[PDB]
Amino acid sequence: ALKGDKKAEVLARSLDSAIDGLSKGYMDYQNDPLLPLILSSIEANVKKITTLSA
Amino acid sequence: LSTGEASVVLAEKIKGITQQNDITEYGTVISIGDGIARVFGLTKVQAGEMVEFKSGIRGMALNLETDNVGVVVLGNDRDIKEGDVVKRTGAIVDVPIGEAMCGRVFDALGNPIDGLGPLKTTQRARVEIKAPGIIPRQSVRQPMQTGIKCVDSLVPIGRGQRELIIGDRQTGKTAIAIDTILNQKEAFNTGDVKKQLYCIYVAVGQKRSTIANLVSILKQHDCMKFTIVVCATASDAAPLQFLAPYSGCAIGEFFRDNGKHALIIYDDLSKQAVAYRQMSLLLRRPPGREAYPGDVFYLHSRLLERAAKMNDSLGGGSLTALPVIETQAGDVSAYIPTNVISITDGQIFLETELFYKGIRPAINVGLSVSRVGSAAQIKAMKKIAGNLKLTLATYRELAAFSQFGSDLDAKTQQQLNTGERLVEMLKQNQYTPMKVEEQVCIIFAGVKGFLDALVTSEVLKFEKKFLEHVRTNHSALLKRIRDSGDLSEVDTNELNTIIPLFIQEGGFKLKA
Amino acid sequence: KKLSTGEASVVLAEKIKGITQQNDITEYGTVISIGDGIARVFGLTKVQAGEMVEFKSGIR
Amino acid sequence: ANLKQLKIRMKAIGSIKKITKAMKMVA
Amino acid sequence: KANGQVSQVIGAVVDVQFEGELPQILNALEVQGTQHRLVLEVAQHLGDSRVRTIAMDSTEGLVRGQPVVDTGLPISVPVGPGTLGRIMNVIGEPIDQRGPIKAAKLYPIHRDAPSFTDQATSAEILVTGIKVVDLLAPYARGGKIGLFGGAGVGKTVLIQELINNVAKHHGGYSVFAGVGERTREGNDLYHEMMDSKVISVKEGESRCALIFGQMNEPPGARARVGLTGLTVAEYFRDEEGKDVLLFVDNIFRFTQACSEVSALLGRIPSAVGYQPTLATDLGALQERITTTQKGSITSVQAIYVPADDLTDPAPATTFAHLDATTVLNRGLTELGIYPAVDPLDSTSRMLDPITIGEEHYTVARGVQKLLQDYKSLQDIIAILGVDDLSEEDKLVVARARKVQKFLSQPFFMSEVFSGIPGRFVNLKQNIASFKALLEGAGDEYPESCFYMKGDLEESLAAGRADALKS
Amino acid sequence: KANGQVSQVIGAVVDVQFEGELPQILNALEVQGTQHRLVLEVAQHLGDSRVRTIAMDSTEGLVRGQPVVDTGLPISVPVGPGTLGRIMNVIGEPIDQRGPIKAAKLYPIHRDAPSFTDQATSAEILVTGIKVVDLLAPYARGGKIGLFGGAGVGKTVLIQELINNVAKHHGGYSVFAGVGERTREGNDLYHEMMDSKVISVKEGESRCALIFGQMNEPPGARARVGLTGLTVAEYFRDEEGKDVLLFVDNIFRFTQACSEVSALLGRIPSAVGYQPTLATDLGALQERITTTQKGSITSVQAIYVPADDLTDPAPATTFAHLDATTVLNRGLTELGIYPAVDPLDST
Amino acid sequence: TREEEWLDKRTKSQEKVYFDQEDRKAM
Amino acid sequence: PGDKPPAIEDSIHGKYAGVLFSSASSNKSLNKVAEDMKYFNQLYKESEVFKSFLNNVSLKRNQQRDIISALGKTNFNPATNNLLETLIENKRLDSLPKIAEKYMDYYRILNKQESITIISAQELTAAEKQKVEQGLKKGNANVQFTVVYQVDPAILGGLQMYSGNNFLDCSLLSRVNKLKTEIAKISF
Numbered sequence A: 001a002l003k004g005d006k007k008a009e010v011l012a013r014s015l016d017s018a019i020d021g022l023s024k025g026y027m028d029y030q031n032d033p034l035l036p037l038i039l040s041s042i043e044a045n046v047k048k049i050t051t052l053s054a
Numbered sequence B: 001l002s003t004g005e006a007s008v009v010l011a012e013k014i015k016g017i018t019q020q021n022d023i024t025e026y027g028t029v030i031s032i033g034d035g036i037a038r039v040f041g042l043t044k045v046q047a048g049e050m051v052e053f054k055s056g057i058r059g060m061a062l063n064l065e066t067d068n069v070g071v072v073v074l075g076n077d078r079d080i081k082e083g084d085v086v087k088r089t090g091a092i093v094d095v096p097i098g099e100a101m102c103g104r105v106f107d108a109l110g111n112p113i114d115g116l117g118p119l120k121t122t123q124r125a126r127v128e129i130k131a132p133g134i135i136p137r138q139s140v141r142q143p144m145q146t147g148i149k150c151v152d153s154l155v156p157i158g159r160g161q162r163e164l165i166i167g168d169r170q171t172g173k174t175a176i177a178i179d180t181i182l183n184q185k186e187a188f189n190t191g192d193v194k195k196q197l198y199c200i201y202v203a204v205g206q207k208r209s210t211i212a213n214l215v216s217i218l219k220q221h222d223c224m225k226f227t228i229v230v231c232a233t234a235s236d237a238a239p240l241q242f243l244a245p246y247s248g249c250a251i252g253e254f255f256r257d258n259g260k261h262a263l264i265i266y267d268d269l270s271k272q273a274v275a276y277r278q279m280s281l282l283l284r285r286p287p288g289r290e291a292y293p294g295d296v297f298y299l300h301s302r303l304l305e306r307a308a309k310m311n312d313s314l315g316g317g318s319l320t321a322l323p324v325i326e327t328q329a330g331d332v333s334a335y336i337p338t339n340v341i342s343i344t345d346g347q348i349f350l351e352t353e354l355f356y357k358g359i360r361p362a363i364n365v366g367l368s369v370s371r372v373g374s375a376a377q378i379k380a381m382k383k384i385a386g387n388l389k390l391t392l393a394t395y396r397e398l399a400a401f402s403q404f405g406s407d408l409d410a411k412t413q414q415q416l417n418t419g420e421r422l423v424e425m426l427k428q429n430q431y432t433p434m435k436v437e438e439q440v441c442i443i444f445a446g447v448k449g450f451l452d453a454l455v456t457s458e459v460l461k462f463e464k465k466f467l468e469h470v471r472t473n474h475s476a477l478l479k480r481i482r483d484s485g486d487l488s489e490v491d492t493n494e495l496n497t498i499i500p501l502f503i504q505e506g507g508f509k510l511k512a
Numbered sequence C: 001k002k003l004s005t006g007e008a009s010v011v012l013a014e015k016i017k018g019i020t021q022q023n024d025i026t027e028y029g030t031v032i033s034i035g036d037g038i039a040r041v042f043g044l045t046k047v048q049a050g051e052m053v054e055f056k057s058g059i060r
Numbered sequence D: 001a002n003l004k005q006l007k008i009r010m011k012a013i014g015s016i017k018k019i020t021k022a023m024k025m026v027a
Numbered sequence E: 001k002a003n004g005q006v007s008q009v010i011g012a013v014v015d016v017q018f019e020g021e022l023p024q025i026l027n028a029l030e031v032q033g034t035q036h037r038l039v040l041e042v043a044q045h046l047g048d049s050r051v052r053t054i055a056m057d058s059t060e061g062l063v064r065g066q067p068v069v070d071t072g073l074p075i076s077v078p079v080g081p082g083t084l085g086r087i088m089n090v091i092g093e094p095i096d097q098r099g100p101i102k103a104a105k106l107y108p109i110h111r112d113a114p115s116f117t118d119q120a121t122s123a124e125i126l127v128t129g130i131k132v133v134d135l136l137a138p139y140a141r142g143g144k145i146g147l148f149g150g151a152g153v154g155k156t157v158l159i160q161e162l163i164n165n166v167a168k169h170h171g172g173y174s175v176f177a178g179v180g181e182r183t184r185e186g187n188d189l190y191h192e193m194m195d196s197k198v199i200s201v202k203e204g205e206s207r208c209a210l211i212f213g214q215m216n217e218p219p220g221a222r223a224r225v226g227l228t229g230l231t232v233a234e235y236f237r238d239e240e241g242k243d244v245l246l247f248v249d250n251i252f253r254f255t256q257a258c259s260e261v262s263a264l265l266g267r268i269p270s271a272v273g274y275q276p277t278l279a280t281d282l283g284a285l286q287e288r289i290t291t292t293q294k295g296s297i298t299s300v301q302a303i304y305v306p307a308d309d310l311t312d313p314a315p316a317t318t319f320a321h322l323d324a325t326t327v328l329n330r331g332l333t334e335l336g337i338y339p340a341v342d343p344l345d346s347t348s349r350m351l352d353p354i355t356i357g358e359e360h361y362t363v364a365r366g367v368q369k370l371l372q373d374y375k376s377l378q379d380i381i382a383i384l385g386v387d388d389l390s391e392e393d394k395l396v397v398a399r400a401r402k403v404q405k406f407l408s409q410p411f412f413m414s415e416v417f418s419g420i421p422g423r424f425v426n427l428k429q430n431i432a433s434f435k436a437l438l439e440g441a442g443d444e445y446p447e448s449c450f451y452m453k454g455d456l457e458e459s460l461a462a463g464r465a466d467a468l469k470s
Numbered sequence F: 001k002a003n004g005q006v007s008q009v010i011g012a013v014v015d016v017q018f019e020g021e022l023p024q025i026l027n028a029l030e031v032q033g034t035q036h037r038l039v040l041e042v043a044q045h046l047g048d049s050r051v052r053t054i055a056m057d058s059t060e061g062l063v064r065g066q067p068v069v070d071t072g073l074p075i076s077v078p079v080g081p082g083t084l085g086r087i088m089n090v091i092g093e094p095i096d097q098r099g100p101i102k103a104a105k106l107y108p109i110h111r112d113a114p115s116f117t118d119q120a121t122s123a124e125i126l127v128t129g130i131k132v133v134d135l136l137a138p139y140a141r142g143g144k145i146g147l148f149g150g151a152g153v154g155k156t157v158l159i160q161e162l163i164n165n166v167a168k169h170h171g172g173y174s175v176f177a178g179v180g181e182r183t184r185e186g187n188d189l190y191h192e193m194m195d196s197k198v199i200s201v202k203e204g205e206s207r208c209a210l211i212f213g214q215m216n217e218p219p220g221a222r223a224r225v226g227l228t229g230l231t232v233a234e235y236f237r238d239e240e241g242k243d244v245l246l247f248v249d250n251i252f253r254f255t256q257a258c259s260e261v262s263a264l265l266g267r268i269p270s271a272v273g274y275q276p277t278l279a280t281d282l283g284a285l286q287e288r289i290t291t292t293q294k295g296s297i298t299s300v301q302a303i304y305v306p307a308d309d310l311t312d313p314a315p316a317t318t319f320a321h322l323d324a325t326t327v328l329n330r331g332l333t334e335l336g337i338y339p340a341v342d343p344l345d346s347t
Numbered sequence G: 001t002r003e004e005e006w007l008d009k010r011t012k013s014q015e016k017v018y019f020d021q022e023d024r025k026a027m
Numbered sequence H: 001p002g003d004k005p006p007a008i009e010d011s012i013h014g015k016y017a018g019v020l021f022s023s024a025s026s027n028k029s030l031n032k033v034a035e036d037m038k039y040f041n042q043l044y045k046e047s048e049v050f051k052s053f054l055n056n057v058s059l060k061r062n063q064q065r066d067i068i069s070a071l072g073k074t075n076f077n078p079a080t081n082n083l084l085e086t087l088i089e090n091k092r093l094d095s096l097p098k099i100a101e102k103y104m105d106y107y108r109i110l111n112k113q114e115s116i117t118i119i120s121a122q123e124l125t126a127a128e129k130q131k132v133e134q135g136l137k138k139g140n141a142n143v144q145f146t147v148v149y150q151v152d153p154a155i156l157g158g159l160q161m162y163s164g165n166n167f168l169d170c171s172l173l174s175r176v177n178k179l180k181t182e183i184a185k186i187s188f
């Protein structure tokens, strides 16, 4: 994700989430794209391994 | 647990990760030198609070002055520059604690230096915390077996006390600590949680090559699985050497408050006083006698006083401390050694003369003493331990008359010889811990006078042969002494009968 | 230098105001600091070494 | 160098020399 | 409404910035916003509405600008029977977890010593049950008692015996102030008094107060917790004419604690690093511990001798204030004699032929001279031996050893270590026992039986028993 | 650009006033307008754009306000096979009149000690030929060795014997570092080394480097000359990988040198006058002299016992860092026993 | 270098031997 | 504001600066003294001869008073004139510049205007910066401020604000490190 190949939305979403924190007293990453990106990859492996107890 | 179930919980855990950031005050450094950073502004900062510099190294705010703030650099201060930013974290110094700490090597701050992988821990406790009160404590009534004959017999150490390993350089101070850790490994293998003792070794101002050799020996004997090593080397900044003792101490409180038993071994504290003195002198504080700060006594007292035996209401846990002190020329009248002796319960004096005369471990029983006394020893040990002390006491007296010579009474020759057997008996090699039950048998044969038959040079080897002979043929005897913990009359008759018998069986020099 | 104990806030404040009122500087002084049984008194000119002085409470 | 130890050892030699000197008289 | 505010925090010293009406010195200030109650004692006025104080609790967690409240009075602690049988903190907090302390009123820990005209000194023998003490260094009821001992010499165990022997069966109350010592001993003593019924949970009982300033407390508290215990004894003295037994643990920690902060306070170190106010700080405490017209206080305070160096300024100045002195020697412990009371160094102001019976005074000096002569013979005996001595000197060495070993007495507190039950020796049996040995009553029997015995008769019985045994 | 200006000159400590972009600590600064170029290592940032530095050469001739140029990097000395058979200065300058040294790269004399992961035991005995040494305190190659002795006890003679028995037959390179010693021995050692064929002017020979911080150098030079020679040894350890014999003359001068300048730096004296950073400063120098997975460095370090007081803080703290110890006693020399080795003190 | 201990041990040693025999006769 | 400077310090320059601010703020005026002390700062750095005069310590008190009077007796607040007279009496004339600067610091603390600095790796577009103003404005919404820009960070696509003495981290770099650390301590 740090590299190119469709990194624009990552920075664009980071800016939006950044201004949100600045406007507020604190900063929380509820809209950060890094978390959903990582979960998507993890969920893929979970679905792959979760086939059957056999 | 099925692999799919565990993976789902793993993924769900990664999903629930929160990260909140709040406004953190920052200040500029007025000056930086020798690891001391004078900060401007940065008000509403707490004493001892953690602060982070531009490079990423942490700092501890110790001196809170109306004009500036005195901060100590917790690392290398080459990158720090005038006017740099200093962000306050808002939390007092702390370190990670838990069970995953065992089997790893960390630094004063708690970072693992083994290079294996990141530390997987979720519990972090404050380094400096108030010691237990009077009610939470409890009388020490559990033995802490070190594996040494002379120690477990003459200077018994009970879980929850404080024993001082004091001596000169290269007198076996570290050898004693290693032998204790090796002995506890056996109890760890067997399923007896009531006797498992987690070992913690705090290295302060020691060359990494020595610590590297130390860790290799533990892995060699497989005793590192229950050992925790905190490293504060000489290259490390003085604050690291100052916090490493308390840092490792907090790790011990984990097992203490959890009803478990932990053993913390503080290396030479004189090195801490130098680092603490250095840290105080550089802060422009008024020095005391020997250039040390005024509250240097409060340092070791606050550290050692935490070791105690928690009552059953809190789990019955215990933390045992074995601080070490290095003397320059065997002078115990110095300031730091005198204070530490008054803080701990007992102290183990190591003599250089005894070391070179073949008495290894070189232990001076005349001065060593323990407050717990026989309260920790087992029934089978107290009975034999009492007579052992009296016999050794007389031998030290007759030592002078040996030079006088020209005559020797029948009894004096016996007492002179009998004592010689005990001294030769208490000797022990390095990296060779002995089981408590095995010591009772050997120490028993000595006081009874059976060792007076064979020549002294054959007593040391007789010990090995006798123990091996017992383990094979007399196995039920060892079990009773271990389980019951008492030397019944039936065992005495059997033991009293085989010891004279075995000496005649084996090939020894019977001529006294 | 580092500082002078005689540079108290009360004495310096009077100078900045510009009022030349010392309240009989001679034969009278104002305590500036107290510690370990020794109290430093500003002013109190014309006092001889080893001479007795009376405090506000009455102690000598 | 720990004057207390040196002064004690000096006292010991003083007594030895004293008793040593006295034994010569009897000798 | 808090008038002051934190301005500087370094170690245990904390400075407060006040706007007006500065607090008097020794006043107690309450810091607001701390997780635990922190009290600051005013010590110096630095000018510009600044005051330097010492923290009683850990300074960690404080913050510059934190509001500070002025109480207007020095540290006040609860006094009265409610403190009897309860552990209390330097600032009066109950650390025994038994609930709040009920006190009829609060007295300050700082007060002026009683005048000289109303001193009302008196001498009265105190039978402590120890033969070596009651003979060579008799104690006076209502006078100070000093136990000079090194590190690990047996002064702590000796205090426990005095409590077991003196505190119990005492009409009046007792106070125990342990400052600077380890906390392990405190828990043991607390459980000991509970098992010994000296203290109990049932109200109206436990005629004994306990105060602890153990090492776990930071500097400043260990230097003032001693004053807290004294205030409790002073209450039981003035308000009620009841004899109070003040058992003070090692006091060197008091002077030591002051030196730990004396540097930060601005004082110049002394010859041995102590504070310049060592004499005055100690004098203010010793003068307050004395008998007056209202009541009497029998204070048993131990003095820790670091490195066995009696020339240290702290203990040296204490000798002048003590009535009875008990100097412990490390050599005796090596020999196995207990209590290891140095017979020559130990002295007692009551050791006067006019004060005590002439017979008691005679037997006392007879033993001192006997031991002094035996010590001089050690030199020649080392080279020549006991055989080369004359018949006159042989008898001196013979009886001297028997008397020296006979001084050893096993007490109840030493049973766990030795395994022999304690024993109590009366003053009459004590004087008569040694008087007989001086005349040669026991010169026939071996010197082995005159060891760890209570009375001479017990030694003779043991001698005959050993005969029939062989 | 000469952004710095000499603020004040006090003995060997010189302060420089800069307009902006202060140099990092340990950075090297060069004063302009003075023959025999002077190098100044940054030590502290006193504030207000003032930095306190230590002088390596005599400060006589400096003028307040004189410009100072900022190099932006610590003292970098040349390292490589060119230093072999060449004498270098505390600042890397050649003082043998042999020409410029040919070094591939210039490494800084300030570097962190090897981590805990990169450590090797190398428990192999080193036969030196001395029976008393090999018997009681046998030296092990790849470990740290320490020679304790007073004034005129046989420390130098013992070093010369080890060089004759070990260094000559040694295969890998060697490094000799002199700290606060008589220059005569440096000259005699250099000529003696040439005569023995251990070193020659022909390229490809002289598997040994020479470094000298003789007493003639002022404070600050004797305190960093060891780092210069040590850096030459670390190169052979890591890059070359072969064994190295790091011969270090009396090192007490290093600690002493720090004490001589600590007072000027504004530090509070230690128990007996030493600097409060004695343990840390010495430790950083000691932790770097250790065997790692790349190569081994058998260091023979001499320790001068001031006034024959082994309880002095400087030598006392050194024992904890040494593997093999050989304490020299003056009593034996009076009896005529040479080498005057104390068997009961040589651990 | 401890001569005071040497005399101390000599004193205790010889005295014990002398009185040990006397203890037998006394019994 | 209660004739109480922002902070109290025992330093030489700090002591005089605090007393002047309190005494000045006491009667009626604070800006008058501010302009006076500011004039000395500009003259202290612009005129070389004036710098040597203040730094000069071997000069006599009577001599210093004459040179000070020659400079100017009017246009300086009485607090400033009394301050100079005190320094001459206490030989603290050499510390004049530090006192002047320190005094302005306290006055600048009373000033409500503050400068906010935003640190961002990628260049801030004109339209993007406008949105930043609404966020900072809505955040405070009760104090005017001036914005400053500086783009030379090591983070990527991260925002870090510095507002006088407060720091709030909105950088993505902080998010990356946080997750990589928590994912490691899963202790599965």
Ligand SMILES: Nc1ncnc2c1ncn2[C@@H]1O[C@H](COP(=O)(O)OP(=O)(O)OP(=O)(O)O)[C@@H](O)[C@H]1O
Pocket (backbone or CB within 6 Å): B167, B168, B169, B170, B171, B172, B173, B174, B175, B176, B326, B360, B361, B428, B429, B430, F319, F320
């Ligand atoms: N009981 C022992 N049995 C056999 N050899 C021993 C024994 N004790 C020490 N040695 C030897 O002494 C050397 C190490 O001593 P050791 O480290 O145990 O003492 P030390 O006081 O910890 O030294 P230092 O203060 O320098 O750390 C080794 O050469 C070791 O073989």
Ligand SMILES: Nc1ncnc2c1ncn2[C@@H]1O[C@H](COP(=O)(O)OP(=O)(O)O)[C@@H](O)[C@H]1O
Pocket (backbone or CB within 6 Å): B369, B370, B371, B372, B373, E150, E151, E152, E153, E154, E155, E156, E157, E158, E338, E339, E411, E414, E417, E418
């Ligand atoms: N009456 C005694 N007889 C024999 N040994 C004793 C006796 N009393 C104490 N010991 C020993 O003294 C030690 C305790 O010393 P202590 O009284 O605590 O000195 P301190 O007051 O300095 O703490 C214990 O190890 C205990 O075994």
Ligand SMILES: Nc1ncnc2c1ncn2[C@@H]1O[C@H](COP(=O)(O)OP(=O)(O)O)[C@@H](O)[C@H]1O
Pocket (backbone or CB within 6 Å): F149, F150, F151, F152, F153, F154, F155, F156, F157, F158, F338, F339
């Ligand atoms: N192996 C030796 N055998 C006989 N005499 C020696 C020996 N070594 C030294 N001497 C003498 O000891 C003296 C001091 O030795 P040296 O190493 O120079 O001490 P220093 O460390 O002060 O330089 C020498 O001048 C030499 O005369």
Ligand SMILES: [Mg+2]
Pocket (backbone or CB within 6 Å): B173, B174, B175
């Ligand atoms: Mg060791």
Ligand SMILES: [Mg+2]
Pocket (backbone or CB within 6 Å): E155, E156, E181, E250
């Ligand atoms: Mg005690």
Ligand SMILES: [Mg+2]
Pocket (backbone or CB within 6 Å): F154, F155, F156, F157
């Ligand atoms: Mg030499």
